[PDB]
């Protein structure tokens, strides 16, 4: 019954917790509460260690008690909130944060937590506002500072940028050395000039969050298979992803499970997310040898069991530290070999992951120390895209001459050839080769549809569709779930691009741009007069900020053109209108790289040091275009400028990309799978020979 006894047991548990003996801390907290059940701080403390353990159901119950006992316990409201947030109850979590702020207007954490809800919802200015409040209230607040730094990054606010970066690095350095969880997220760590064994350590440290959550299951190590006898000579590969559905990762690899050779491999796909109804999910389900819905098995222990009992040899992590991940599954270690692949552009830092599937251009051996996993090399690029399958209507194009330009008025369509054969005066410019409709009555009808902004027209019985209206014609085609069944017109005038200008595009989200990158681009734009830069409102609130820094750098408003974010198919297609694409060196376009290359638009890149900044170079190396890879900023500007000023060289490079995108291995999902299969077999031969993982650099 004694509050002073209970108080002691609390202090003793706080001690066992500092030494990370969480096991024992709980036992003590629980005794403290058996002695004195009305003890507010013991309830709160027990709750926050249950939250660390992922026992959210029970952690919540103890937070509620803490509040009942001490109603002004602002701190407990805030943590309850975090628990509800992790339990997917964002509504009630938000109510907790607001309620804390009412009780203690001066309490920084609740402000920060509130800002976190806003950030997640995509409303970034309200996120900034709340983070700023928190920092006014508590100027030394690493979590809020870094989160704010990221929001600012997202909207391209570069106020006191250089000083801001030095502080982030400083904050991380301090947290790593004090053995705290860093405030920068591993999935963001490539955006900041971090000291790089740092990036690895930030990842490592997020890996640990899993260990704590799986220990409470007390699961013995699993017994992995040591031959292929049970699995009938077939190597069992499990792909684990929360992204079998409408997601970039599916837009890259949806064709792969079906392309595996069924004589040597048995393919299991473990979905971490429910069926979103899209064709992407349909395909994977239909083509994988086995499809397993783990969103129905929410307990990590039971799910890992299932993986093991299915008999997997290689388990593939397609998530890393992206939303939806359940790395606890990998931490449980149900398969003898476990590899990172494709979905996450960095190291996991975790011991439970064995290999990272990458390539020699992305991760040269010089920089093996960036990754905790052993490197496993694909022979060309580890990147792949499903564009050949998704958007075959962009394999060939045709243009309208309105005065011979390949990117001013563009037609694509499965039945394009047939339509052109019904026309009288088609000229065939050689390169395949590109048909050119002359300015006749037909050409005018097409242009009129585009100018008047109409949905579609008919010409000689063929359906001609307006490129801006595809979601109205066939919504599944707009998303990339179907191949369009009409001929589609795409024009510069549609997006307010000048008919007779050099267009430099970048279709990435704006967070990938930094003040140096924008400087580089300004340099290129001044040196190539009449040229424009083509960017997306991604997000829209970022636009005025860029316009601002642009004019600061002496570029009138009209030299940068912003378009809205398009549906997947329109987005890929309208790349055809660009002349060159300028790739962000901070963090490369990834899926976006593939998207711009599929349109046959050359892309200038400058491979940095981090994985994420080397992918574009890797894609280009594979395509066979070494002349678009710069060694430094001066070279980047030069390549770009040459492309803009020397029209003969441009046509040459553009033609080379247009050709190579079929003929190189870059978009060839069959060849890719086969290379991936060879890599898997290497990893296995090695393991079955009794060896621990080492580099597979061929």
């Amino acid at each position: 019954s004694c509050p002073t006894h209970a108080d002691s047991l609390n202090n003793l548990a706080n001690i066992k917790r500092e030494q990370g003996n969480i096991e024992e801390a709980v036992r003590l907290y629980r005794k403290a509460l058996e002695v004195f059940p009305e003890f507010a701080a013991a309830h709160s403390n027990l709750a926050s260690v249950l939250q660390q353990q992922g026992k959210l159901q029970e952690a919540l119950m103890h937070y509620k008690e803490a509040i009942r006992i001490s109603p002004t316990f602002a701190d407990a409201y805030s943590n309850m909130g975090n628990t509800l947030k992790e339990m997917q109850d964002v509504q009630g979590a938000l109510q907790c944060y607001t309620r804390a702020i009412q009780i203690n207007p001066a309490f920084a954490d609740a402000h920060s937590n509130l800002a976190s809800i806003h950030k997640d919802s995509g409303n970034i200015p309200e996120a900034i506002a709340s983070y700023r409040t928190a920092l006014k209230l508590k100027p030394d607040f690493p979590d809020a500072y870094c989160n704010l730094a990221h929001c600012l990054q997202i909207v391209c606010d570069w106020t006191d940028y250089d000083e801001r970066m030095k502080k982030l690095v400083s904050i991380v350095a301090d947290q790593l050395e004090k053995n705290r969880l860093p405030s920068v997220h591993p999935h963001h760590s490539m955006l900041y000039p971090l000291s790089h064994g740092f990036r690895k350590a930030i990842a490592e440290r997020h890996g640990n969050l899993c260990l704590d959550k799986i220990n409470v299951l007390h699961k013995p190590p699993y017994e992995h298979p040591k031959d292929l006898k049970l699995s009938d000579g077939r190597l069992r590969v499990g792909y684990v992803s929360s992204d079998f559905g409408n997601h970039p990762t599916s837009h890259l690899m949806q064709s792969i499970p079906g392309m595996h050779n069924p004589d040597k491999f048995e393919v299991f796909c473990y979905a971490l997310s429910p069926d979103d109804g899209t064709n992407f999910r349909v395909k994977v389900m239909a083509e994988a040898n086995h499809f397993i819905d783990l969103s129905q098995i929410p307990c990590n222990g039971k799910a890992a069991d299932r993986i093991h009992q299915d008999g997997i040899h290689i388990l593939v992590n397609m998530n890393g530290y992206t939303k939806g991940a359940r790395n606890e599954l990998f931490a449980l270690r149900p398969a003898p070999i476990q590899a990172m692949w494709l979905g996450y552009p960095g190291t996991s830092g975790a011991l439970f992951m064995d290999y990272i599937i990458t390539d020699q251009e992305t991760s040269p051996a010089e920089v093996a120390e960036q990754y905790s996993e052993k490197l496993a090399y694909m022979p060309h690029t580890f990147f792949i895209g499903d564009h050949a399958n998704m958007f075959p209507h962009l394999k060939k194009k045709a243009v309208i001459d309105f005065k011979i330009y390949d990117n001013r008025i563009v037609l694509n369509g499965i039945d394009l050839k047939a339509f052109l054969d019904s026309l009288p005066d088609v000229k065939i410019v050689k390169m395949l080769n590109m048909p050119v409709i002359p300015m006749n009555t037909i050409a005018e009808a097409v242009i009129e549809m585009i100018n008047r902004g109409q949905i579609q027209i008919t010409i000689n019985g063929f359906s001609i569709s307006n490129g801006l209206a595809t979601t109205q014609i066939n919504n599944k085609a707009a998303t990339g779930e179907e191949v369009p069944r009409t001929i589609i017109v795409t024009t510069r005038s549609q997006y307010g691009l000048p008919e007779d200008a050099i267009v430099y595009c970048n279709f990435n989200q704006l967070y990938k741009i930094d003040p140096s990158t924008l400087q580089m681009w300004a340099n290129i734009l001044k040196r190539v007069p009449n040229s424009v830069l083509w960017l997306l409102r991604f997000p829209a609130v970022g636009e005025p900020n860029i316009q601002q820094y642009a004019q600061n750098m002496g570029l009138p408003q009209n030299r940068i053109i912003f378009s809205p974010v398009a549906p997947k198919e329109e987005h890929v297609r309208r790349g055809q209108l660009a002349d060159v694409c300028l790739d962000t060196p901070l963090c490369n376009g990834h899926t976006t790289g593939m998207d711009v290359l599929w349109a046959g638009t050359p892309m200038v890149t400058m491979p940095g040091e981090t994985l994420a900044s080397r992918v574009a170079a890797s894609q280009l190396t594979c395509l066979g275009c070494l002349e678009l890879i710069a060694k430094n900023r001066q070279e980047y500007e030069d390549i770009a400028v040459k492309l803009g000023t020397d029209l003969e060289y441009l046509k040459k490079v553009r033609g080379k990309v247009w050709k190579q995108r079929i003929s190189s291995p870059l978009f060839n999902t069959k060849q890719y799978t086969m290379e991936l299969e060879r890599l898997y077999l290497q990893m296995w031969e090695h393991y079955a020979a009794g060896n621990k993982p080492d580099h597979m650099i061929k």
């Binding site: 409408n246 997601h247 970039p248």
Partner: peptide
Amino acid sequence: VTPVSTA
């Protein structure tokens, strides 16, 4: 509406 890789 237009899905992206998120942290």
